[PDB]
Amino acid sequence: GNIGNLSAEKQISVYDGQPFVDEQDVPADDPNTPALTIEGPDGYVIAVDAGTPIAPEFRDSNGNKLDPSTRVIVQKCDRQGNPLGDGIVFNDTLGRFDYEQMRTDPDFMRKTAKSLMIDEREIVKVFVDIPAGANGYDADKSRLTLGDDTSDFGKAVEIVDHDELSDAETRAV
Amino acid sequence: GNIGNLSAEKQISVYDGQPFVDEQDVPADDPNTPALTIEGPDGYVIAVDAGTPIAPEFRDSNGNKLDPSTRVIVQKCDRQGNPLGDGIVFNDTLGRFDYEQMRTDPDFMRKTAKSLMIDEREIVKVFVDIPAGANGYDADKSRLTLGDDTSDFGKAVEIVDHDELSDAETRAV
Amino acid sequence: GNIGNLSAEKQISVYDGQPFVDEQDVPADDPNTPALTIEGPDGYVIAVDAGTPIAPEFRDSNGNKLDPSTRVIVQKCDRQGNPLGDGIVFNDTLGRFDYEQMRTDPDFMRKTAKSLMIDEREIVKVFVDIPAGANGYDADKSRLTLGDDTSDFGKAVEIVDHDELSDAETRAV
Amino acid sequence: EYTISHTGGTLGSSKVTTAANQTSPQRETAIIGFECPRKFAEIEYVGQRDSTRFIPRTTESITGTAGDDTVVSLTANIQPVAGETAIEDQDYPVAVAYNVTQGVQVDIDAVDYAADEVTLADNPADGDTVKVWPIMGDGDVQFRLVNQFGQEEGRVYPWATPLYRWHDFPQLKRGREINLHGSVTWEENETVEVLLDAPQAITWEDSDYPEGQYVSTFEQDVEITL
Amino acid sequence: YTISHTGGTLGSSKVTTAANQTSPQRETAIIGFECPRKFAEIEYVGQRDSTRFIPRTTESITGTAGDDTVVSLTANIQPVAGETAIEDQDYPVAVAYNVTQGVQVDIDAVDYAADEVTLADNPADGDTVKVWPIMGDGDVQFRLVNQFGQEEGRVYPWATPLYRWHDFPQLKRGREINLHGSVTWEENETVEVLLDAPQAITWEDSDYPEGQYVSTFEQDVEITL
Amino acid sequence: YTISHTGGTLGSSKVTTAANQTSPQRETAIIGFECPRKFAEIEYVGQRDSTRFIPRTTESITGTAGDDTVVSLTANIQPVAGETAIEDQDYPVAVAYNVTQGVQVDIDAVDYAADEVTLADNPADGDTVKVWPIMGDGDVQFRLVNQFGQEEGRVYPWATPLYRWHDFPQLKRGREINLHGSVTWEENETVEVLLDAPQAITWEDSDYPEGQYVSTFEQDVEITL
């Protein structure tokens, strides 16, 4: 009744519900709030190649999609919560997104630009630049799906435990 | 006044109205009764390469679709018409077949997984495993379309008369 | 305040609203009269190949569509405006189009056949073989594009100015 | 020498082709004869790229009487237009209706494909007269050659082809459009005929049709020398 | 020497197990696929052979005046394939049935955000109606069990959310689900599909109109003989 | 160290000027993107940078009995994305508003041929209604100007038809718009979107429901810091 062993390279996906991410309420006039705080697992390590899909299903408390004049950014920070500035992966508006099929058709999948790596403590954050009007933001009635680990389309996020020389060179930030 | 010399491998598709395929109204839960019986044409050989589509447009007497949880199976039988156990080309359900476009979009098509070869006498049977509650099977208001011979998508069914070495190797059953 | 250099082959989309193709309202059984007169623009050479689409948005005076079964043919003509027997690129009908989405998706497009190359005086004429039942052709509310210059899909119209070897070879008609 | 693609069909290149109906008792018989003209020299068929369109239709005729919104199984196993059911989303109407008394068009409401029935909005009068043209269902066609004597010379993919596939596929979509099978040569005065077998009337020349001029339409593509 | 098959709600034998979970937030075993004596082995290969899951739960309401709206169903709803209109889905978000009249009810409108809906049939007072909507939240995964009753282990310990099964057009190739890991069976061994969630999945409710099963689980696999 | 970004209706500055045209068919200038001091310069790359445009116009009527129907709007109306049914379209073809009742109207249906529509409710004799459909026919292009008010050029001197902007699903790659040519801004320079058309495209009708803006523009761009 064997199962088949695996390497460390777990091909997975990422979203709000997992216990290393926290959503947060966001009003409509701050591009500097930690919308999402994505903290490392404290002993495993994540890797993302560029060209990785995103599905930012953001709506309001009344369920309507927000004003596509709004911009969204995903960005790396330090181990405290201070953005590194460089290492950005994404910057675009919601107008380039189609919630009806944004995570299904490859011809709608907005992907990453530059690769990324998260050690046992490295932080990722999301930032949302919004005009005055569009009813804020509720994450409880919204969600996100980062990467895809089900299709042949898109790609998945790599995770590993500690293997020696891989970690020795993963320290090469 | 020429005809053009044609390969005897005629590429077609198959349905119920043809006079070598008989139907049978099915009760509720008789998975051993064959709904359809495909007898060979008494003079030719059929070939179905693997990677071949099906469209089993099944409904009841009132015209509604059957249960999606139905199991549908295609199987070759002996010259008597009893199942060989092995030699299956298909095993799946109806819910996997969107009736509107199961024969339209290649992105929705369900294909075979095996080659197959039918002589003048070899028999195929389409079996249906159903729960008790369903409204049977009304072949007078349902049909099947095996293969495509019309589009630049999918594949077809080869039919041939008798050629020498082909028959010599065909009788290697 | 730069614009960048533009090479010879300008990619555009031919359509009714341009000053080198003229329309004309039509009867319902006068095919020899032209729907369109498509002149050499008197200083350029034009190229269009196989795979070039059309958007024959042909409505009647009310807006209701023309007859489906009307045949639709494209031809090269001389500098007098008479065909050449050869010099054909297209032969199909109106009802083969779908005014809802004929230009939207490529899969609902009709396209030309051959290579073609137009000098400063050469003429293309589109001819239209209608049966009696139809309500002619009303160019005003109607319209036509020959091509597209917006998608990665399909193709466009190639417009070239005068260059020595290319002109000397392409005048080998 | 030069070769090009051309299209034959209902009218086509030359006004010598001939359309005629089959038997109501089922018989495979001559229907649509493409005869070669001397405008050309010779014709070539190359199926699987030689695309083809066919719309069928038929006729039913009923009368006015109180309480009639529903029209019956028309002896025609109707199907939806390539999977779509309600007409407003269909490529073409599954059926069309006319009040000949009022001399106008009718709006169709709904369908039941199982019992092959439909339902309208404007309930008609008593003693009135109404025409309907629904698409054809069952039936099957094929091609054939004949010489300049009426003598056969060989068939063209000697195999019937069902009618309802022309409905089941969205005919106008490239990749999905219909390409029959065959590859055949003509000479100057040879004829090549489509045959049909179906129960009901292959309706052409319904002058009462408010929408076009051919309720049932036919087109194909072929290869040509000159 | 192998071919393909489907394991499913009924499948190759009536020795499977079909049960329902608990409301206390503690996982259970929804399904048990036990091998028969017929086959030497069963094998599932994540990323190769697809899996399908149409979960669905059960709720109930009492009739009274103005009772055309249905309240929060305790369920984080989403549309099917991201599409909302019930008449244009690959399968319904939800269905319901009046028992007092003993018929199915059509649904008029939806509020995905508020998790509420609106019907045409205003029921009578004291009436009884039942609803079967898709299941919302839920964390699922696989497990192995020997011929003794022991957990050999899970597979690829990263449980996928339930709602992804709803989110995609599962029938269309390329978008179908292919979970991860690998696993092998033997004659008396039993794999289980396990789930954790608040709400109670259901099956085999007789009053359901569109089949003898409200909800299904299917999986393409490879088989030795 | 450049980046990909977007200009548009508001883009990244409240300097852009959007201006209605005239009825006499002059090649009018509408939407002027002024480069700021913030950046070194702006880059446009046709065949690379997607572009989005939703035009929308204004008409009006005084209603009476039996006035469920609205005639041709002097506008060659077109379907959206190969669809006519409103709810499925990527955006509405049109919306309208009862000013006397001071509310939105939901639509019954369309007659694309005669460019007519019909509503759900009937207005009153004395009632007034306004309508905002997407614009129909006409042609557009781009123009270049410096901080000295003289035309610094035009972009690929051939206009595109208005209708193709509607006809495609703007966001889908492959189907998105990509014009031809290139251009680079400088500091106080400016680029103006020009149009000719019969009818008055407009903006910011106060009584319009769906937001502050009836019509919108976006364009992918590159910024050299």
mmCIF file of N, CA, C and O in Angstrom, chain B residues 1-6 9-16 18 20 57 59 61-63 99-100 103-106 140-141 143-145 148-153 159, chain D residues 48 77 79 82-85 114-116 145 153-154 157-160 162 164-165 168-170 173-181 183-187 190:
data_model
loop_
_atom_site.group_PDB
_atom_site.id
_atom_site.type_symbol
_atom_site.label_atom_id
_atom_site.label_comp_id
_atom_site.label_asym_id
_atom_site.label_seq_id
_atom_site.Cartn_x
_atom_site.Cartn_y
_atom_site.Cartn_z
ATOM 1 N N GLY B 1 -13.525 12.006 -67.692
ATOM 2 C CA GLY B 1 -14.512 11.606 -66.707
ATOM 3 C C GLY B 1 -13.952 10.640 -65.690
ATOM 4 O O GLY B 1 -14.258 9.450 -65.724
ATOM 5 N N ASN B 2 -13.133 11.161 -64.787
ATOM 6 C CA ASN B 2 -12.476 10.364 -63.768
ATOM 7 C C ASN B 2 -13.131 10.570 -62.417
ATOM 8 O O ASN B 2 -13.796 11.578 -62.161
ATOM 9 N N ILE B 3 -12.905 9.594 -61.548
ATOM 10 C CA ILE B 3 -13.415 9.612 -60.187
ATOM 11 C C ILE B 3 -12.374 10.068 -59.189
ATOM 12 O O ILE B 3 -12.745 10.533 -58.103
ATOM 13 N N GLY B 4 -11.096 9.892 -59.488
ATOM 14 C CA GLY B 4 -10.062 10.053 -58.498
ATOM 15 C C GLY B 4 -9.951 8.766 -57.720
ATOM 16 O O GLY B 4 -10.944 8.278 -57.173
ATOM 17 N N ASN B 5 -8.753 8.205 -57.664
ATOM 18 C CA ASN B 5 -8.526 6.990 -56.907
ATOM 19 C C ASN B 5 -8.513 7.353 -55.433
ATOM 20 O O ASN B 5 -7.815 8.285 -55.022
ATOM 21 N N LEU B 6 -9.311 6.637 -54.652
ATOM 22 C CA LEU B 6 -9.575 6.960 -53.262
ATOM 23 C C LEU B 6 -9.050 5.852 -52.374
ATOM 24 O O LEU B 6 -9.170 4.670 -52.705
ATOM 25 N N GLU B 9 -9.761 3.383 -46.933
ATOM 26 C CA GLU B 9 -10.000 3.763 -45.546
ATOM 27 C C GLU B 9 -10.924 4.975 -45.547
ATOM 28 O O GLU B 9 -10.500 6.132 -45.574
ATOM 29 N N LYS B 10 -12.219 4.689 -45.528
ATOM 30 C CA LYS B 10 -13.224 5.734 -45.493
ATOM 31 C C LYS B 10 -13.399 6.250 -44.078
ATOM 32 O O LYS B 10 -13.672 5.481 -43.156
ATOM 33 N N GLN B 11 -13.258 7.558 -43.923
ATOM 34 C CA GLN B 11 -13.331 8.247 -42.640
ATOM 35 C C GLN B 11 -14.758 8.748 -42.456
ATOM 36 O O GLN B 11 -15.213 9.602 -43.224
ATOM 37 N N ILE B 12 -15.480 8.198 -41.475
ATOM 38 C CA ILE B 12 -16.871 8.558 -41.216
ATOM 39 C C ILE B 12 -17.079 8.753 -39.720
ATOM 40 O O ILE B 12 -16.136 8.757 -38.928
ATOM 41 N N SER B 13 -18.345 8.919 -39.347
ATOM 42 C CA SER B 13 -18.804 8.829 -37.971
ATOM 43 C C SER B 13 -20.094 8.019 -37.953
ATOM 44 O O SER B 13 -20.677 7.721 -38.999
ATOM 45 N N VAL B 14 -20.534 7.659 -36.746
ATOM 46 C CA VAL B 14 -21.485 6.574 -36.549
ATOM 47 C C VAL B 14 -22.622 7.030 -35.650
ATOM 48 O O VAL B 14 -22.433 7.815 -34.717
ATOM 49 N N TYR B 15 -23.808 6.503 -35.931
ATOM 50 C CA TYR B 15 -25.036 6.909 -35.270
ATOM 51 C C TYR B 15 -25.987 5.717 -35.262
ATOM 52 O O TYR B 15 -25.643 4.624 -35.722
ATOM 53 N N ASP B 16 -27.194 5.932 -34.744
ATOM 54 C CA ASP B 16 -28.117 4.844 -34.451
ATOM 55 C C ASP B 16 -28.949 4.427 -35.652
ATOM 56 O O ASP B 16 -29.300 3.250 -35.782
ATOM 57 N N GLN B 18 -28.321 3.799 -38.608
ATOM 58 C CA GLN B 18 -27.720 2.951 -39.615
ATOM 59 C C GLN B 18 -28.167 1.505 -39.422
ATOM 60 O O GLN B 18 -28.438 1.080 -38.297
ATOM 61 N N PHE B 20 -26.907 -1.352 -39.059
ATOM 62 C CA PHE B 20 -26.059 -2.336 -38.399
ATOM 63 C C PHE B 20 -25.922 -2.028 -36.915
ATOM 64 O O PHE B 20 -24.979 -2.512 -36.265
ATOM 65 N N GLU B 57 -25.854 11.608 -26.796
ATOM 66 C CA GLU B 57 -26.899 12.525 -26.381
ATOM 67 C C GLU B 57 -28.078 11.710 -25.859
ATOM 68 O O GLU B 57 -28.942 11.268 -26.623
ATOM 69 N N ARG B 59 -31.344 11.130 -23.288
ATOM 70 C CA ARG B 59 -32.452 11.750 -22.570
ATOM 71 C C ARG B 59 -33.434 10.648 -22.198
ATOM 72 O O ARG B 59 -33.233 9.473 -22.523
ATOM 73 N N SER B 61 -37.791 9.506 -21.807
ATOM 74 C CA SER B 61 -38.976 9.575 -22.642
ATOM 75 C C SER B 61 -39.600 10.960 -22.616
ATOM 76 O O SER B 61 -40.032 11.459 -23.659
ATOM 77 N N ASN B 62 -39.653 11.598 -21.450
ATOM 78 C CA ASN B 62 -40.135 12.970 -21.386
ATOM 79 C C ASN B 62 -39.160 13.964 -21.994
ATOM 80 O O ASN B 62 -39.537 15.121 -22.201
ATOM 81 N N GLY B 63 -37.923 13.551 -22.266
ATOM 82 C CA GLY B 63 -36.964 14.354 -22.977
ATOM 83 C C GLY B 63 -35.888 14.967 -22.114
ATOM 84 O O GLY B 63 -34.884 15.447 -22.651
ATOM 85 N N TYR B 99 -23.978 18.619 -23.060
ATOM 86 C CA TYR B 99 -24.732 18.265 -24.258
ATOM 87 C C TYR B 99 -24.746 19.370 -25.301
ATOM 88 O O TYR B 99 -24.875 19.091 -26.497
ATOM 89 N N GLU B 100 -24.599 20.623 -24.877
ATOM 90 C CA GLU B 100 -24.764 21.731 -25.805
ATOM 91 C C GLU B 100 -23.619 21.771 -26.797
ATOM 92 O O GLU B 100 -23.817 22.084 -27.976
ATOM 93 N N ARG B 103 -19.866 18.038 -28.746
ATOM 94 C CA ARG B 103 -19.378 17.727 -30.083
ATOM 95 C C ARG B 103 -18.921 18.969 -30.837
ATOM 96 O O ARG B 103 -18.619 18.876 -32.030
ATOM 97 N N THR B 104 -18.839 20.119 -30.167
ATOM 98 C CA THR B 104 -18.523 21.388 -30.804
ATOM 99 C C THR B 104 -17.129 21.886 -30.450
ATOM 100 O O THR B 104 -16.299 22.094 -31.339
ATOM 101 N N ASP B 105 -16.854 22.089 -29.165
ATOM 102 C CA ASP B 105 -15.568 22.598 -28.732
ATOM 103 C C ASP B 105 -14.617 21.434 -28.513
ATOM 104 O O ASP B 105 -14.938 20.543 -27.714
ATOM 105 N N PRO B 106 -13.446 21.397 -29.151
ATOM 106 C CA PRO B 106 -12.420 20.446 -28.704
ATOM 107 C C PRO B 106 -12.020 20.645 -27.260
ATOM 108 O O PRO B 106 -11.612 19.693 -26.587
ATOM 109 N N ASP B 140 -35.778 6.332 -28.802
ATOM 110 C CA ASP B 140 -36.532 7.023 -29.832
ATOM 111 C C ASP B 140 -36.358 8.530 -29.757
ATOM 112 O O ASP B 140 -36.605 9.217 -30.753
ATOM 113 N N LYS B 141 -35.942 9.050 -28.600
ATOM 114 C CA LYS B 141 -35.699 10.466 -28.400
ATOM 115 C C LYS B 141 -34.274 10.769 -27.974
ATOM 116 O O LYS B 141 -34.002 11.899 -27.556
ATOM 117 N N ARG B 143 -29.858 9.671 -28.911
ATOM 118 C CA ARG B 143 -29.019 9.171 -29.981
ATOM 119 C C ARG B 143 -27.559 9.243 -29.573
ATOM 120 O O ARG B 143 -27.213 9.640 -28.457
ATOM 121 N N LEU B 144 -26.706 8.905 -30.527
ATOM 122 C CA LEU B 144 -25.274 8.870 -30.342
ATOM 123 C C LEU B 144 -24.627 9.336 -31.629
ATOM 124 O O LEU B 144 -25.133 9.065 -32.719
ATOM 125 N N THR B 145 -23.505 10.026 -31.487
ATOM 126 C CA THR B 145 -22.686 10.448 -32.617
ATOM 127 C C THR B 145 -21.252 10.124 -32.223
ATOM 128 O O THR B 145 -20.655 10.817 -31.396
ATOM 129 N N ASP B 148 -16.091 12.247 -35.673
ATOM 130 C CA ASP B 148 -16.374 13.356 -36.563
ATOM 131 C C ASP B 148 -15.694 13.108 -37.893
ATOM 132 O O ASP B 148 -14.571 12.602 -37.949
ATOM 133 N N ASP B 149 -16.397 13.481 -38.956
ATOM 134 C CA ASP B 149 -15.935 13.324 -40.326
ATOM 135 C C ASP B 149 -16.167 14.602 -41.112
ATOM 136 O O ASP B 149 -16.224 14.574 -42.344
ATOM 137 N N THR B 150 -16.272 15.721 -40.411
ATOM 138 C CA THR B 150 -16.771 16.964 -40.964
ATOM 139 C C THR B 150 -15.853 18.134 -40.718
ATOM 140 O O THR B 150 -15.809 19.046 -41.553
ATOM 141 N N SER B 151 -15.119 18.134 -39.621
ATOM 142 C CA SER B 151 -14.363 19.267 -39.142
ATOM 143 C C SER B 151 -12.880 18.962 -39.209
ATOM 144 O O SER B 151 -12.456 17.814 -39.361
ATOM 145 N N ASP B 152 -12.092 20.020 -39.072
ATOM 146 C CA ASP B 152 -10.656 19.907 -38.922
ATOM 147 C C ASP B 152 -10.239 19.652 -37.476
ATOM 148 O O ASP B 152 -9.050 19.763 -37.159
ATOM 149 N N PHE B 153 -11.187 19.321 -36.602
ATOM 150 C CA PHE B 153 -10.927 18.884 -35.244
ATOM 151 C C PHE B 153 -11.359 17.438 -35.095
ATOM 152 O O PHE B 153 -12.021 16.867 -35.962
ATOM 153 N N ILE B 159 -13.276 2.785 -42.181
ATOM 154 C CA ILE B 159 -13.924 1.573 -42.660
ATOM 155 C C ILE B 159 -13.222 1.141 -43.932
ATOM 156 O O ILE B 159 -12.810 1.971 -44.746
ATOM 157 N N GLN D 48 -12.544 17.877 -47.307
ATOM 158 C CA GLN D 48 -11.894 18.195 -46.035
ATOM 159 C C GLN D 48 -11.328 19.612 -45.999
ATOM 160 O O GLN D 48 -10.980 20.112 -44.926
ATOM 161 N N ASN D 77 -38.394 15.066 -36.150
ATOM 162 C CA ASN D 77 -37.632 15.048 -34.916
ATOM 163 C C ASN D 77 -36.744 16.273 -34.861
ATOM 164 O O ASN D 77 -35.609 16.261 -35.344
ATOM 165 N N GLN D 79 -34.381 19.296 -33.525
ATOM 166 C CA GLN D 79 -33.218 19.428 -32.669
ATOM 167 C C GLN D 79 -32.958 20.903 -32.436
ATOM 168 O O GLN D 79 -33.462 21.749 -33.182
ATOM 169 N N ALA D 82 -27.462 23.651 -32.922
ATOM 170 C CA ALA D 82 -26.090 23.482 -32.466
ATOM 171 C C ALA D 82 -25.979 23.569 -30.950
ATOM 172 O O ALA D 82 -24.980 24.054 -30.416
ATOM 173 N N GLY D 83 -27.008 23.096 -30.256
ATOM 174 C CA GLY D 83 -27.025 23.036 -28.811
ATOM 175 C C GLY D 83 -27.850 24.117 -28.165
ATOM 176 O O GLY D 83 -28.370 23.900 -27.064
ATOM 177 N N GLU D 84 -28.002 25.262 -28.810
ATOM 178 C CA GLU D 84 -28.784 26.350 -28.255
ATOM 179 C C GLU D 84 -30.260 26.094 -28.505
ATOM 180 O O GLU D 84 -30.661 25.636 -29.576
ATOM 181 N N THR D 85 -31.065 26.410 -27.499
ATOM 182 C CA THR D 85 -32.470 26.045 -27.466
ATOM 183 C C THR D 85 -33.388 27.177 -27.885
ATOM 184 O O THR D 85 -34.114 27.057 -28.874
ATOM 185 N N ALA D 114 -38.740 17.239 -27.270
ATOM 186 C CA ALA D 114 -39.026 15.819 -27.120
ATOM 187 C C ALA D 114 -40.256 15.423 -27.918
ATOM 188 O O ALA D 114 -40.196 14.542 -28.779
ATOM 189 N N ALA D 115 -41.385 16.048 -27.617
ATOM 190 C CA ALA D 115 -42.606 15.843 -28.373
ATOM 191 C C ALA D 115 -42.650 16.680 -29.639
ATOM 192 O O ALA D 115 -43.675 16.665 -30.325
ATOM 193 N N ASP D 116 -41.584 17.416 -29.952
ATOM 194 C CA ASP D 116 -41.448 18.087 -31.237
ATOM 195 C C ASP D 116 -42.518 19.157 -31.419
ATOM 196 O O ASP D 116 -43.009 19.387 -32.526
ATOM 197 N N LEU D 145 -21.824 10.673 -59.275
ATOM 198 C CA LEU D 145 -21.518 11.139 -60.623
ATOM 199 C C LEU D 145 -22.412 10.468 -61.658
ATOM 200 O O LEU D 145 -22.867 9.338 -61.463
ATOM 201 N N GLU D 153 -21.258 6.431 -63.309
ATOM 202 C CA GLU D 153 -19.832 6.204 -63.518
ATOM 203 C C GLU D 153 -19.062 5.881 -62.253
ATOM 204 O O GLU D 153 -17.885 5.520 -62.356
ATOM 205 N N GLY D 154 -19.671 5.970 -61.092
ATOM 206 C CA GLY D 154 -18.982 5.823 -59.827
ATOM 207 C C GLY D 154 -19.581 6.829 -58.880
ATOM 208 O O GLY D 154 -20.064 7.885 -59.276
ATOM 209 N N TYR D 157 -17.901 9.101 -52.337
ATOM 210 C CA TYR D 157 -17.962 8.699 -50.952
ATOM 211 C C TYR D 157 -19.259 7.937 -50.723
ATOM 212 O O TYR D 157 -20.191 8.463 -50.102
ATOM 213 N N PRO D 158 -19.367 6.706 -51.224
ATOM 214 C CA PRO D 158 -20.674 6.051 -51.288
ATOM 215 C C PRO D 158 -21.204 5.747 -49.910
ATOM 216 O O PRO D 158 -21.167 4.618 -49.414
ATOM 217 N N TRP D 159 -21.676 6.803 -49.281
ATOM 218 C CA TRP D 159 -22.084 6.757 -47.901
ATOM 219 C C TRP D 159 -23.028 7.905 -47.646
ATOM 220 O O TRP D 159 -22.757 9.046 -48.026
ATOM 221 N N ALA D 160 -24.140 7.590 -47.008
ATOM 222 C CA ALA D 160 -25.065 8.623 -46.605
ATOM 223 C C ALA D 160 -24.403 9.529 -45.583
ATOM 224 O O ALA D 160 -23.364 9.199 -45.006
ATOM 225 N N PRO D 162 -25.890 12.220 -42.386
ATOM 226 C CA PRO D 162 -27.137 12.649 -41.755
ATOM 227 C C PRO D 162 -27.405 14.118 -41.974
ATOM 228 O O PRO D 162 -26.506 14.902 -42.283
ATOM 229 N N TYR D 164 -28.991 16.059 -39.560
ATOM 230 C CA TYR D 164 -29.023 16.872 -38.355
ATOM 231 C C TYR D 164 -27.651 17.380 -37.937
ATOM 232 O O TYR D 164 -27.583 18.262 -37.081
ATOM 233 N N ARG D 165 -26.565 16.905 -38.545
ATOM 234 C CA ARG D 165 -25.254 17.454 -38.214
ATOM 235 C C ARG D 165 -25.122 18.884 -38.703
ATOM 236 O O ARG D 165 -24.451 19.714 -38.070
ATOM 237 N N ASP D 168 -26.367 20.518 -35.859
ATOM 238 C CA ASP D 168 -25.609 20.325 -34.637
ATOM 239 C C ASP D 168 -24.332 21.135 -34.606
ATOM 240 O O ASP D 168 -23.834 21.427 -33.514
ATOM 241 N N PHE D 169 -23.777 21.462 -35.767
ATOM 242 C CA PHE D 169 -22.576 22.273 -35.816
ATOM 243 C C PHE D 169 -22.917 23.727 -36.136
ATOM 244 O O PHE D 169 -23.768 23.985 -36.990
ATOM 245 N N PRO D 170 -22.266 24.704 -35.489
ATOM 246 C CA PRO D 170 -22.492 26.094 -35.882
ATOM 247 C C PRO D 170 -21.794 26.381 -37.190
ATOM 248 O O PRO D 170 -20.623 26.771 -37.216
ATOM 249 N N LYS D 173 -18.599 28.644 -38.354
ATOM 250 C CA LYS D 173 -17.381 28.789 -37.573
ATOM 251 C C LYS D 173 -16.263 27.981 -38.215
ATOM 252 O O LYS D 173 -16.408 26.771 -38.419
ATOM 253 N N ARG D 174 -15.153 28.644 -38.529
ATOM 254 C CA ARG D 174 -14.041 27.936 -39.140
ATOM 255 C C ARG D 174 -13.480 26.924 -38.157
ATOM 256 O O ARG D 174 -13.452 27.138 -36.943
ATOM 257 N N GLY D 175 -13.060 25.791 -38.703
ATOM 258 C CA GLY D 175 -12.636 24.664 -37.902
ATOM 259 C C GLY D 175 -13.785 23.730 -37.603
ATOM 260 O O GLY D 175 -13.596 22.516 -37.498
ATOM 261 N N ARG D 176 -14.986 24.295 -37.474
ATOM 262 C CA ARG D 176 -16.187 23.562 -37.145
ATOM 263 C C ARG D 176 -17.113 23.377 -38.326
ATOM 264 O O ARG D 176 -17.940 22.460 -38.300
ATOM 265 N N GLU D 177 -17.003 24.220 -39.347
ATOM 266 C CA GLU D 177 -17.798 24.112 -40.560
ATOM 267 C C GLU D 177 -17.651 22.753 -41.217
ATOM 268 O O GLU D 177 -16.729 21.992 -40.912
ATOM 269 N N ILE D 178 -18.552 22.463 -42.139
ATOM 270 C CA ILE D 178 -18.719 21.120 -42.665
ATOM 271 C C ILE D 178 -17.876 20.964 -43.913
ATOM 272 O O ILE D 178 -17.980 21.760 -44.852
ATOM 273 N N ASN D 179 -17.055 19.927 -43.918
ATOM 274 C CA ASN D 179 -16.349 19.473 -45.098
ATOM 275 C C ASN D 179 -16.721 18.022 -45.326
ATOM 276 O O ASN D 179 -16.394 17.158 -44.509
ATOM 277 N N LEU D 180 -17.415 17.763 -46.420
ATOM 278 C CA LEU D 180 -17.721 16.401 -46.817
ATOM 279 C C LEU D 180 -16.457 15.747 -47.350
ATOM 280 O O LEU D 180 -15.379 16.346 -47.376
ATOM 281 N N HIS D 181 -16.591 14.510 -47.803
ATOM 282 C CA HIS D 181 -15.475 13.707 -48.259
ATOM 283 C C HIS D 181 -15.632 13.394 -49.733
ATOM 284 O O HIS D 181 -16.748 13.259 -50.242
ATOM 285 N N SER D 183 -13.064 13.287 -53.732
ATOM 286 C CA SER D 183 -12.188 14.024 -54.629
ATOM 287 C C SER D 183 -12.372 13.453 -56.020
ATOM 288 O O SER D 183 -12.043 12.289 -56.259
ATOM 289 N N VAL D 184 -12.889 14.278 -56.929
ATOM 290 C CA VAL D 184 -13.516 13.808 -58.155
ATOM 291 C C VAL D 184 -13.254 14.846 -59.233
ATOM 292 O O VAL D 184 -13.138 16.040 -58.954
ATOM 293 N N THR D 185 -13.160 14.374 -60.475
ATOM 294 C CA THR D 185 -12.926 15.208 -61.641
ATOM 295 C C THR D 185 -14.116 15.158 -62.583
ATOM 296 O O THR D 185 -14.791 14.132 -62.697
ATOM 297 N N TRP D 186 -14.348 16.272 -63.265
ATOM 298 C CA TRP D 186 -15.391 16.431 -64.263
ATOM 299 C C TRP D 186 -14.775 16.551 -65.651
ATOM 300 O O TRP D 186 -13.556 16.620 -65.818
ATOM 301 N N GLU D 187 -15.651 16.590 -66.651
ATOM 302 C CA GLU D 187 -15.317 17.095 -67.974
ATOM 303 C C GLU D 187 -16.434 18.041 -68.393
ATOM 304 O O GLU D 187 -17.262 18.410 -67.560
ATOM 305 N N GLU D 190 -20.384 16.661 -68.063
ATOM 306 C CA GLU D 190 -20.675 15.654 -67.060
ATOM 307 C C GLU D 190 -21.415 16.298 -65.905
ATOM 308 O O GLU D 190 -21.249 17.494 -65.634
#
